[PDB]
């Protein structure tokens, strides 16, 4: 449960997560999750989180208030620089 370091940046035509070594073949994975289910369930739920996870580190979430701007998909739009250990997604 170690919080990695994310580097959000407004693009135009993207998140840059530095990840220490996993030592496994499985690349880091993203998923789009809704705020409807949570450990505390408090009011104001009603937005989406772009969630990132890997076994080495812990899980990280990014709030999305816009309805559509990008596609949170694995094959279409992610890249894994496993050698330098930086993770990509746009």
């Amino acid at each position: 449960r170690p919080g990695y370091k994310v580097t959000k940046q407004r693009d135009s035509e993207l998140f840059q997560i530095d990840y220490p070594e996993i030592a496994e073949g499985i690349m880091p994975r993203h998923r789009f999750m809704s705020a409807y289910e949570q450990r505390i369930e408090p009011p104001d739920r009603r937005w989406q989180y772009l969630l990132m996870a890997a076994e080495p580190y812990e899980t990280i979430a990014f709030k999305v208030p816009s309805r559509e701007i990008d596609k949170a998909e694995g094959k279409f739009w992610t890249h894994w620089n496993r050698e330098t250990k930086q993770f990509f997604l746009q």
Partner: peptide
Amino acid sequence: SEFKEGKA
């Protein structure tokens, strides 16, 4: 633990 996670 934080430096290991590479987030600090």
